[PDB]
């Protein structure tokens, strides 16, 4: 089969535009499905050195199959640009309900870093370090389930560094990310759920490196005393003591804490969502 063109598709509102892409909504049109398609410029990547950004997302998401993760399913170009048709979350991005309901309630901060650490699970077993992982890229399905994306800065295993409120203090001081670099990102996740507002927070950047480096953080008074814990598990400085990590025996007793004690990890992604708040 011939690779699909633009025309293919009639391509519908922009739901978003970074730095170097805009994502918009798009219908193919033989077959009437919806997807977001990540349209990337390349004269502007290739004159800002971002290409291997470009392969390693397409390489990356290409082997990503699993319910939590976004799928690409197609790449075709022109002169201008490189197409990426990714799956849609037509719910859109988990920092928009921390911003519309503020914080989450025990049950829905249970059940979403429940789904979390499900697909760290799945992501670090393939050797991939998601390297980025916040609100603004853990996107809700129609169904509201999760559905990671945003994977052109991760790390596989075979100078960057991510968003200030998420990053590691391994990535900051040695350069170097590790799978549980993303397991200190779900540490500030669970305690944005929690608290409606991320632990390490300051002025500016460089500030908020200071903070994190030190461990500053404090605990308001409205957090729950099991994922007040399991947060102390996981904000730890030295990166092969986080509880999940390798170094302390994996997803298993991670999954056991019992901040996650009414949870049924099964089949996670066929249970129906607590209603947010
Ligand atoms: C800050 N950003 C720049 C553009 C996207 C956004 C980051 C979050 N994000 C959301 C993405 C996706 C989707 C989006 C759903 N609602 C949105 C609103 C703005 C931007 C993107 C989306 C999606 O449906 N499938 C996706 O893969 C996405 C796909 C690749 C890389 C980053 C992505
Ligand atoms: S859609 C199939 C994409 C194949 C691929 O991995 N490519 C194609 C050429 N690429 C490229 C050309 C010009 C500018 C940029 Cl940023 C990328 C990326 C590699």
Redesign the pocket.
């Known amino acids: 089969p011939r690779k699909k063109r633009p025309e293919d598709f009639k391509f519908g509102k922009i739901?978003?535009?970074?730095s170097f892409?805009t994502?918009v909504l798009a219908r193919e049109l033989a077959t009437s499905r919806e997807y977001?398609i990540?349209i990337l410029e390349k004269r502007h990547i290739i004159k800002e050195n971002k290409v291997p950004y470009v392969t390693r997302e397409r390489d990356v998401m290409s082997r990503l199959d699993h319910p939590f993760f976004?799928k690409l399913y197609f790449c075709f170009q022109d002169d201008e640009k490189l197409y990426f048709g990714?799956?849609?979350?037509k719910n859109?991005?988990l920092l928009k309900y921390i911003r519309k309901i503020g914080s989450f309630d025990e049950t829905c901060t249970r059940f979403y870093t429940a789904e979390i650490v499900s697909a760290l699970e799945y992501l670090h077993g393939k050797g991939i370090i998601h390297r980025d992982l916040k609100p603004?890229?853990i996107?809700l399905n129609e169904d509201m389930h999760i559905q990671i994306?945003?994977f052109?800065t991760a790390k596989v295993l075979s100078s960057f560094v991510g968003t200030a409120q998420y990053v590691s203090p391994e990535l900051l001081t040695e350069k170097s990310a590790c799978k549980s670099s993303d397991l200190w990102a779900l540490g500030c996740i669970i305690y944005q759920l929690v608290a409606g507002l991320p632990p390490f927070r300051a002025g500016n950047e460089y500030l908020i490196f200071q903070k994190i480096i030190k461990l500053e953080y404090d605990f308001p008074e409205k957090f729950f005393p099991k994922a007040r814990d399991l947060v102390e598990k996981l904000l730890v400085l030295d990166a092969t003591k986080r509880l999940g990590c390798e170094e302390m025996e994996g997803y298993g007793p991670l999954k056991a804490h019992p901040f996650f004690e009414s949870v049924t990890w099964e089949n996670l992604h066929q249970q129906t969502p607590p209603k947010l708040t």
Request: glycine content about 20%; aromatic content about 4%.
């Open positions: 739901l978003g535009e970074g892409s994502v977001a990540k976004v990714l799956s849609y979350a859109g991005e603004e890229n996107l994306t945003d052109g």
